Structures are given as structure tokens and as C-alpha cells.
Scaffold this active site. Sequence first.
Site, PDB file in Angstrom:
ATOM      1  N   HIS A   1       0.729  -1.271   0.000  1.00 45.60           N
ATOM      2  CA  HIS A   1       0.000   0.000   0.000  1.00 45.60           C
ATOM      3  C   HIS A   1       0.760   1.324   0.000  1.00 45.60           C
ATOM      4  O   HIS A   1       0.144   2.373  -0.074  1.00 45.60           O
ATOM      5  CB  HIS A   1      -0.968  -0.036   1.197  1.00 45.60           C
ATOM      6  CG  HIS A   1      -1.894  -1.208   1.177  1.00 45.60           C
ATOM      7  ND1 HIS A   1      -2.830  -1.394   0.180  1.00 45.60           N
ATOM      8  CD2 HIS A   1      -2.010  -2.278   2.008  1.00 45.60           C
ATOM      9  CE1 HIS A   1      -3.486  -2.522   0.395  1.00 45.60           C
ATOM     10  NE2 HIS A   1      -3.008  -3.078   1.502  1.00 45.60           N
TER      11      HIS A   1
ATOM     12  N   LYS B   1      -3.866 -10.026  -7.927  1.00 42.33           N
ATOM     13  CA  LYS B   1      -4.587  -9.538  -6.764  1.00 42.33           C
ATOM     14  C   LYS B   1      -5.722  -8.715  -7.397  1.00 42.33           C
ATOM     15  O   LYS B   1      -5.463  -7.792  -8.174  1.00 42.33           O
ATOM     16  CB  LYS B   1      -3.685  -8.656  -5.905  1.00 42.33           C
ATOM     17  CG  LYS B   1      -4.377  -8.231  -4.633  1.00 42.33           C
ATOM     18  CD  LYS B   1      -3.375  -7.594  -3.705  1.00 42.33           C
ATOM     19  CE  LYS B   1      -3.911  -7.517  -2.314  1.00 42.33           C
ATOM     20  NZ  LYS B   1      -4.330  -6.174  -1.929  1.00 42.33           N
TER      21      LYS B   1
ATOM     22  N   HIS C   1      -3.343  -3.373   7.800  1.00 38.33           N
ATOM     23  CA  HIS C   1      -4.347  -3.695   6.781  1.00 38.33           C
ATOM     24  C   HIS C   1      -4.952  -2.403   6.268  1.00 38.33           C
ATOM     25  O   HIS C   1      -5.112  -1.453   7.034  1.00 38.33           O
ATOM     26  CB  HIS C   1      -5.502  -4.572   7.333  1.00 38.33           C
ATOM     27  CG  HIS C   1      -5.090  -5.949   7.767  1.00 38.33           C
ATOM     28  ND1 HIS C   1      -4.497  -6.851   6.910  1.00 38.33           N
ATOM     29  CD2 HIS C   1      -5.184  -6.575   8.968  1.00 38.33           C
ATOM     30  CE1 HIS C   1      -4.234  -7.970   7.565  1.00 38.33           C
ATOM     31  NE2 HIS C   1      -4.639  -7.828   8.815  1.00 38.33           N
ATOM     32  N   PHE C   2      -5.252  -2.350   4.971  1.00 39.40           N
ATOM     33  CA  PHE C   2      -5.904  -1.173   4.393  1.00 39.40           C
ATOM     34  C   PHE C   2      -7.389  -1.540   4.364  1.00 39.40           C
ATOM     35  O   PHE C   2      -7.803  -2.435   3.591  1.00 39.40           O
ATOM     36  CB  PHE C   2      -5.417  -0.918   2.966  1.00 39.40           C
ATOM     37  CG  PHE C   2      -5.887   0.386   2.400  1.00 39.40           C
ATOM     38  CD1 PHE C   2      -7.092   0.471   1.699  1.00 39.40           C
ATOM     39  CD2 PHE C   2      -5.144   1.545   2.608  1.00 39.40           C
ATOM     40  CE1 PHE C   2      -7.550   1.709   1.218  1.00 39.40           C
ATOM     41  CE2 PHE C   2      -5.590   2.783   2.136  1.00 39.40           C
ATOM     42  CZ  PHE C   2      -6.807   2.858   1.432  1.00 39.40           C
ATOM     43  N   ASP C   3      -8.199  -0.891   5.207  1.00 41.83           N
ATOM     44  CA  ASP C   3      -9.632  -1.237   5.264  1.00 41.83           C
ATOM     45  C   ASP C   3     -10.477  -0.613   4.161  1.00 41.83           C
ATOM     46  O   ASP C   3     -11.307  -1.296   3.555  1.00 41.83           O
ATOM     47  CB  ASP C   3     -10.228  -0.843   6.617  1.00 41.83           C
ATOM     48  CG  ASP C   3     -11.446  -1.661   6.968  1.00 41.83           C
ATOM     49  OD1 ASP C   3     -11.332  -2.908   6.914  1.00 41.83           O
ATOM     50  OD2 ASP C   3     -12.500  -1.059   7.309  1.00 41.83           O
TER      51      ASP C   3
HETATM   52 CL    CL Z   1      -6.672  -2.418  -0.825  1.00 40.78          CL
END
Ligand code: CL
EC number: 4.6.1.18
Length: 124
Positions: free
Chosen positions: A12, A41, A119-121
Site C-alpha cells: 500500500h 490480486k 491492513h488497508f480497510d
Molecule cells: Cl486495498
Amino acid sequence: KETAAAKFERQHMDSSTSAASSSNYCNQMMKSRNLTKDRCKPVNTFVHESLADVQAVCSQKNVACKNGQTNCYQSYSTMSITDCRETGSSKYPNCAYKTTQANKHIIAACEGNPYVPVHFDASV
Ligand SMILES: [Cl-]
Ligand SMILES: [Cl-]
Ligand SMILES: [Cl-]
């Protein structure tokens, strides 16, 4: 095994550009960051801010994560981001992505000591 913080960085962070420069940004970045090695992905967001600014979100606005967890934080300011998502003609090993640049707040799940993003929420 990759640590959770390092995986968040790799997936990210893109502090080298202020914004996606062209429609081909995602194809290049998804490949560069090894997010198309064994499979494509499907969705992935890159943040164009310094690592320090993104890590700082972990001490900003505490909000629920989509999954119901309570360790998510929403950035007080908007940030430059690029969402990368597979298009209809995408098919491993020939992944193809749509590049969408935006300025929004990011929401990250944080953990550990130091307490950093894992984590990217979502973005708002
Ligand atoms: Cl993402
Ligand atoms: Cl680490
Ligand atoms: Cl890697």
C-alpha cells in the site's frame, strides 16, 4: 515470512510519486510490488504520502473496521491515493488493471508495538 507491517508497506505505500501519472500506473505497480506473481490480486490501493504520514493515522480517529474489529483509524486529512482493480480482460498471467486516482481519507487497521498499519480497510 513477511511481517504484517512490511506486507502493508509493500502493498500500500507509494511515496515516490504524488499521484498516478497515467492509466498504466496500476499495471506497472501491481507487477513491481509482486502482486501478480502467482495470481492477479483483484483490488489494491496505493497511498501517495510519506510512510510517516501513513503510520501516523494509527493515532488519529478510531473507527470500526468493516469486519467489526475496533483497531481501525481514519486519517484526519485526505490523502492522494490510487485504486487498482482488475478489468474484464484481466486473466493471469496477463493481469490488467484500471487506475483510479483520488484524494480521500484512508482507513487502516493497526497493531503491534510500534503500533503501525497492518491492513488497508477502505478509503472515504
Ligand atoms: Cl486495498
Ligand atoms: Cl517490519
Ligand atoms: Cl516481494
